[PDB]
Design a protein around this ligand. Sequence first.
Ligand SMILES: [Mg+2]
Lengths: 215, 216
Amino acid sequence: TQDYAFQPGLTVGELLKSSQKDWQAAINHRFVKELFAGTIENKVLKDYLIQDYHFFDAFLSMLGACVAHADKLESKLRFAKQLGFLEADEDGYFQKAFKELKVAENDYLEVTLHPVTKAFQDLMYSAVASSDYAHLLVMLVIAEGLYLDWGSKDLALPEVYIHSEWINLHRGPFFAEWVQFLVDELNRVGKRLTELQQRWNQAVALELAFFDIGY
Amino acid sequence: QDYAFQPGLTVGELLKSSQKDWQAAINHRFVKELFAGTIENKVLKDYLIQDYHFFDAFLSMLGACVAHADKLESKLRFAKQLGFLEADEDGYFQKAFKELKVAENDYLEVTLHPVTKAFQDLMYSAVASSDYAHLLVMLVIAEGLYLDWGSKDLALPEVYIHSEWINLHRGPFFAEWVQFLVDELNRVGKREDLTELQQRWNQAVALELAFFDIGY
Ligand SMILES: [Mg+2]
């Protein structure tokens, strides 16, 4: 009975039941509230974005592994489209945000990885190493679906670019239809759930933990 | 031998042993007839149907490079090319199949030519290796050999289905992409398994040559 910004369907609907407390805590996190308000401190957003750019590095790799291992050309093409979008608009945002926050290249590329970032990369790269489209989709449905869920909150957008654009990259019809594609794909291939569910639960917990990094 | 790209050290070495096949491929009847606008619809159709299955595995290799490259800047460049391919190259295939009256089932659900199958096996073994250098061998050949014929000093043909296949493998954007792939193979290749990279390299050039015979 929990409503989400996407339509979970069968397998994703099942997977979601065990992660509800963490999922709701993540989308209602102080980070999200302060980002929408425009009140989030620069030092908090900066620390989050530096770590998130390392998440982004592994996230790109998971998308690439889906192009590599998906079973349908139509699906490979959709991942390819998303990769093009991410290189233009999302990497463009990171570059602009780092410039605004006065972070030199070496200080966003050559970083101490927070333990949560390290845990996430390990889990993301084990999905890559599995060469298993369903394991990759678990990670991606969570990363993108949970971000759509907070991104689509009914709160007025903040004024400053570094705030509004991070919301906008995770909101609106294009991103919503992308998330529904990922969900549809996990439902298609998932109807296989113990190891998928254990991965799912851990990844939702890490999404929640990630929002505390900057605080 | 001159090439449309700058081979550098490792790629320059790898090219030595595939020269006969490389030169035969870039001067193949297919290329000649495509530039001249004389290629028969049947020939181009049969090539494109098989090449769309090459394209399927080709996308997968680019994806595997996003997965396994050692630098974020490189991952991003592969991501940018994947976006280009989904828009402009898949767009061309769809338009070409419409023009050539090939229904979706008749380009998706078809008999793979023995050369197409051999190429897919070699491409998927590069994916399975998770080894950026092996993937780059395949891509430097696929893209660099196509730049080499695409950049011939000839005016483009009149008809869209001819000109656009050349266009997709010609010009500064594609040339810079090829040079990026060559630069990356030189960077990561400079390897205790040069023999194995060479074996893969020679076989892929041979299959590029054989692929042009499919439509004939
Ligand atoms: Mg607001």
